[PDB]
Write a protein that binds this ligand. Structure first.
Ligand SMILES: *C(=O)c1nc(NC(=O)Nc2cc(O[C@H](C)c3c(Cl)cncc3Cl)c(C#N)cn2)c(OCCN2CCOCC2)cc1CN1CCN(C)CC1=O
Length: 299
């Protein structure tokens, strides 16, 4: 690969740390970087480094190069994982990105569910869990803002889900793994991940049935993500296996309103799941609708 001086970072300024996770074509590890800001060349920061797995094929390499090029072109936004640099010369290919210290939004919510009524009261806040309604609305608003940014740069996510939203130390939501090669013409719809996820449950019907993806297909997925937020990290279509999911979607089935979810938010979920993609809100409209709720409840 040729040297791009805008982005190239010396690989000897990285100290690789513990792995974070792996995807279809790469693996991600934490690392310390020294001098990511060239004006502070000895300053340490913690970053996430994506690289190829050991068994990597030429297709895996092309997929990682494509992701790097998308990340170069996307530009910076507060509510996405941003590219920090790359290492292409004299060693393995590294794509260096921001690291989100609290992990993904699904894990963040499930770890913060409120105390159950089996716990003995201890102090004045025994009933108060970490999560409050305005903070849940803020998470949703921030995801919508990041998706609005990505849409403005002509980027379609194609698997938007709470596990693909990351959470920083300051509870900033950052959309991850956008614009990736996802093998959309060879999806095993029955595939379950190592954590039990069925990604088919986030697909808009035009994507699942017709292999058509638009920004409005991402809006459908955002509605599933909203349901995940307001169930504190629940898995969608509870109890429904994939074979049953296909038949229910053909019949127009939608998820029920979850407990402790106001009608404003279930209303937005149902708009995001309208059958016709043009009858779903745009991301700009979702940002505005969620901002109105957020402002009302933050007074
Ligand atoms: C660096 O800030 C960091 N990051 C994490 N977790 C993390 O997920 N960071 C992350 C991952 C990531 O992509 C991977 C593939 C991923 C994963 Cl692993 C899971 N779901 C989706 C995705 Cl897409 C990207 C990108 N691009 C960016 N950042 C971290 O963790 C701690 C483990 N913890 C997580 C929360 O629940 C319990 C488990 C830790 C850190 C840095 N820190 C902070 C604190 N110190 C003490 C230890 C540390 O290493």
């Amino acid at each position: 690969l040729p040297l791009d001086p805008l982005w190239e970072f010396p690989r000897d300024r990285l100290v690789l740390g513990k792995p974070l996770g792996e995807g279809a074509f790469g693996q991600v590890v934490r690392a310390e970087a020294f001098g990511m800001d060239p004006a502070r060349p000895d300053q340490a920061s913690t970053v996430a480094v994506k690289m190829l797995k050991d068994n990597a094929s030429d297709k895996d390499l092309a997929d990682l190069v494509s992701e790097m090029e998308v990340m170069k072109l996307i530009g910076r936004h507060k509510n996405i994982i941003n590219l920090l640099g790359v290492c292409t010369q004299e060693g393995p290919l590294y794509v260096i990105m921001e690291c989100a210290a609290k992990g993904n939004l699904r894990e963040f919510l499930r770890a913060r569910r409120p105390p159950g009524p089996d716990l003995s009261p201890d102090g004045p806040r025994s009933s108060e869990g970490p999560l409050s309604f305005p903070v849940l609305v803020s998470c949703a608003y921030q995801v919508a803002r990041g998706m609005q940014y990505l849409e403005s740069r002509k980027c379609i996510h194609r698997d938007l889900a709470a596990r693909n939203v990351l959470v920083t130390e300051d509870n900033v939501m950052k959309i991850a793994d956008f614009g990736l090669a996802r093998g959309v013409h060879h999806i095993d719809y029955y595939k379950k991940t190592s954590n039990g996820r069925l990604p088919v449950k986030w697909m808009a019907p035009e994507a699942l049935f017709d292999e058509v993806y638009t920004h409005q297909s991402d809006v459908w997925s955002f509605g599933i993500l909203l349901w995940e937020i307001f169930t504190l990290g629940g898995s969608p279509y509870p109890g429904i296996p994939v074979e049953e999911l296909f038949s229910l979607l053909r019949e127009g089935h939608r998820m029920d309103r979850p407990p402790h979810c106001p009608p404003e938010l279930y209303g937005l979920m149902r708009e995001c799941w309208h059958a016709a993609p043009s009858q779903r809100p745009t991301f700009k409209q979702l940002v505005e609708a969620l901002d109105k709720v957020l402002l009302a409840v933050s007074e």
